[PDB]
Amino acid sequence: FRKMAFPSGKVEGCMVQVTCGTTTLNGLWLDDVVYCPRHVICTSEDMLNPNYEDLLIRKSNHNFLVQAGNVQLRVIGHSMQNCVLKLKVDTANPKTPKYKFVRIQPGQTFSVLACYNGSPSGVYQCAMRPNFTIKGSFLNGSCGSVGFNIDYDCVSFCYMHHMELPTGVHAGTDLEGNFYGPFVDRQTAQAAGTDTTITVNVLAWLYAAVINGDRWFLNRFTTTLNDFNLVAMKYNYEPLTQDHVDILGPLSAQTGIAVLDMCASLKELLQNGMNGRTILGSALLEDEFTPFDVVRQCS
Amino acid sequence: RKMAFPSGKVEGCMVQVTCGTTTLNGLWLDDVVYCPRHVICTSEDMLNPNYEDLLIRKSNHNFLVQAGNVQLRVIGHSMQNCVLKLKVDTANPKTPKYKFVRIQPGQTFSVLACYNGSPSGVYQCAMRPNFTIKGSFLNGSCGSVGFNIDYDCVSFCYMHHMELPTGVHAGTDLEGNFYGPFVDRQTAQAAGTDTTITVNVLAWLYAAVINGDRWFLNRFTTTLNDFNLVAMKYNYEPLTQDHVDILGPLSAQTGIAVLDMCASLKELLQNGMNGRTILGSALLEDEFTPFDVVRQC
Numbered sequence: 134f135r136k137m138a139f140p141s142g143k144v145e146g147c148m149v150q151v152t153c154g155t156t157t158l159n160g161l162w163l164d165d166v167v168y169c170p171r172h173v174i175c176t177s178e179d180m181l182n183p184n185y186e187d188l189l190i191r192k193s194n195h196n197f198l199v200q201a202g203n204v205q206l207r208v209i210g211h212s213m214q215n216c217v218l219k220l221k222v223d224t225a226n227p228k229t230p231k232y233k234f235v236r237i238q239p240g241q242t243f244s245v246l247a248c249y250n251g252s253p254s255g256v257y258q259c260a261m262r263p264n265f266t267i268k269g270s271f272l273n274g275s276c277g278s279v280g281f282n283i284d285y286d287c288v289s290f291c292y293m294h295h296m297e298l299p300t301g302v303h304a305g306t307d308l309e310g311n312f313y314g315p316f317v318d319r320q321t322a323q324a325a326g327t328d329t330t331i332t333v334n335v336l337a338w339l340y341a342a343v344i345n346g347d348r349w350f351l352n353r354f355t356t357t358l359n360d361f362n363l364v365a366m367k368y369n370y371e372p373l374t375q376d377h378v379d380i381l382g383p384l385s386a387q388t389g390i391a392v393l394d395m396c397a398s399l400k401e402l403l404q405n406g407m408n409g410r411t412i413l414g415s416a417l418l419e420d421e422f423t424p425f426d427v428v429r430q431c432s
Numbered sequence: 433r434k435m436a437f438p439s440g441k442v443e444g445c446m447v448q449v450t451c452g453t454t455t456l457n458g459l460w461l462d463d464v465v466y467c468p469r470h471v472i473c474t475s476e477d478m479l480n481p482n483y484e485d486l487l488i489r490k491s492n493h494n495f496l497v498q499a500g501n502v503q504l505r506v507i508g509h510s511m512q513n514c515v516l517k518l519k520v521d522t523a524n525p526k527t528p529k530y531k532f533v534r535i536q537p538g539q540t541f542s543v544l545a546c547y548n549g550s551p552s553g554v555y556q557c558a559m560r561p562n563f564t565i566k567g568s569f570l571n572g573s574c575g576s577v578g579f580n581i582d583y584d585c586v587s588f589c590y591m592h593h594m595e596l597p598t599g600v601h602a603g604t605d606l607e608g609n610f611y612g613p614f615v616d617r618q619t620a621q622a623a624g625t626d627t628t629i630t631v632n633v634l635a636w637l638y639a640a641v642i643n644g645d646r647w648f649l650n651r652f653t654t655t656l657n658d659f660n661l662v663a664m665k666y667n668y669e670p671l672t673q674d675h676v677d678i679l680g681p682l683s684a685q686t687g688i689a690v691l692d693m694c695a696s697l698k699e700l701l702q703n704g705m706n707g708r709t710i711l712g713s714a715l716l717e718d719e720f721t722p723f724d725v726v727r728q729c
């Protein structure tokens with residue numbers, strides 16, 4: 134199974150650059166609005182503890198340089214929504230796809246179009262860790278790059294990039310400017326909670342193994358959801374939610390293996406280990422393929 | 433992380449091509465649509481297709497090309513090796529600057545997997561030394577293409593034709609010549625013995641150092657030939673002096689001589705990873721080139 138990203142073209146058609154002074158990052162141009170991280174308005178001195186409301190009062194439309202390539206887009210209004218700046222522009226993006234703004238849950242995956250100076254460099258598939266960081270390739274200049282899923286013709290934007298944490302992982306907001314996790318857009322030392330394994334995705338991976346004929350680990354038993362969750366937490370696995378059980382529904386129906394029976398098989402793997410065997414050609418359980426990802430690549 | 437090129441410039445070229453009950457993808461550049469020639473086969477034909485004979489029996493109107501909701505009229509067709517070229521009466525305004533290249537084993541490229549002319553996903557692949565690729569391709573993916581992007585220029589290097597029994601994939605360049613000893617007939621084909629792309633494993637090890645990981649480093653060194661003796665024993669490709677040269681930038685960046693990293697890789701091959709992981713992986717990764725690593729660090 135490959136880490137497979139969504140085709141990026143519908144998002145490429147929405148990327149622009151936004152500059153204040155000498156600070157340039159990326160923005161997202163949808164209809165007549167450009168969305169970008171509010172710290173574009175910061176100098177280095179503001180970034181230690183910015184007063185964003187005061188910084189913004191000192192700004193006017195004519196202080197923002199928005200470019201699609203080398204072509205300037207005139208700003209006609211500005212406002213701040215949580216940690217994102219919204220710049221109204223005088224031109225509706227003709228490449229605007231059908232879109233939605235969604236706030237994803239930890240464990241969900243998405244594609245990131247890594248951009249520098251409004252120019253796309255690469256696309257890759259990311260998972261939101263339970264501690265609300267992502268393990269990505271973001272360099273200086275990548276802020277404002279977005280993460281997304283594509284359903285039918287509709288791009289669901291879920292992530293906008295803002296920062297790198299001391300440990301090398303990345304943090305950001307949804308497109309309404311609300312950070313994922315306990316982070317703030319200040320150049321201060323901040324720590325992500327200890328990470329955990331994404332149980333629902335491991336289960337999806339076991340279902341994938343079954344679909345492909347690799348099923349030695351299926352046992353004759355079952356468990357309750359509460360009993361599984363209490364055990365799982367002792368192994369630094371996330372507890373399952375009702376939504377997790379529901380999104381495993383299609384794979385459970387495809388295989389005829391009840392979700393809680395698979396939970397009991399996983400519990401045995403956690404308590405006894407692999408005993409030298411492999412699953413899908415690996416002794417490690419994979420936790421960055423969602424149940425949807427599994428469906429995508431198998432069917 | 434494994435990064436693919438942005439696929440928009442290729443998405444605007446994908447179309448659907450149908451002949452009989454066979455539908456797959458084509459690549460529409462200017463006024464020509466390129467697709468695998470086996471679109472003209474039937475159940476019967478597939479086992480031993482005499483393509484020139486099957487093709488001479490086709491008319492332009494036996495080919496249905498669809499770009500979204502619009503049918504493109506075929507006004508001419510020709511065959512170049514395993515690729516069919518359909519001339520259509522309208523030019524693709526979304527045609528990027530492009531070239532056709534034939535890549536070398538060990539080089540990487542992005543694949544835009546498409547079904548019924550519609551882009552479905554994008555991922556990064558390497559041309560294996562045995563000229564397969566480890567892709568993710570289902571029924572309907574034939575005609576999907578692989579590419580690299582340099583400046584605004586798309587270099588197409590791969591069109592998809594086949595899944596081998598082992599689950600790996602085979603296909604052609606855009607001149608229609610297969611990579612490898614494979615044939616576009618409906619038969620179970622085995623590849624040559626695969627080997628590991630050593631220059632890429634070394635680039636990946638350097639990448640792991642850059643990201644603050646070095647449990648596998650050691651104080652030893654090795655000559656080039658002595659490393660290559662061990663590499664070949666473990667079905668790793670030999671490392672050439674041009675490979676060593678190509679690795680210079682990563683060596684400079686990290687202060688680790690190429691042959692010192694070869695000594696670390698030697699140790700890993702002989703001992704294994706002893707349960708440990710490098711950049712999250714239980715296995716040595718060989719599908720990042722030195723260029724891929726440098727660009728991303």
Ligand SMILES: *[C@](O)(C(=O)NCc1ccccc1)[C@H](C[C@@H]1CCNC1=O)NC(=O)[C@H](CC(C)C)NC(=O)OCc1ccccc1
Binds near residue numbers: 172
């Ligand atoms: C992001 O602001 C960005 O990419 N800005 C454009 C730019 C152009 C030229 C030089 C620098 C930046 C940036 C993205 C970071 C940088 C390295 N990897 C990333 O993901 N984000 C930031 O710099 C944060 C801004 C504050 C206001 C939140 N600060 C931050 O990430 O703090 C830690 C850090 C770690 C390494 C390097 C820089 C900063």
Ligand SMILES: *[C@](O)(C(=O)NCc1ccccc1)[C@H](C[C@@H]1CCNC1=O)NC(=O)[C@H](CC(C)C)NC(=O)OCc1ccccc1
Binds near residue numbers: 478569573595621
């Ligand atoms: C490719 O022809 C394709 O996608 N065709 C359109 C299509 C196919 C089937 C149903 C609907 C529409 C196809 C791609 C394969 C299929 C599964 N995964 C892939 O990557 N390619 C082929 O089917 C090959 C055609 C030949 C004529 C080149 N056949 C093939 O891969 O055979 C392998 C094989 C294995 C064992 C025994 C015999 C053959």
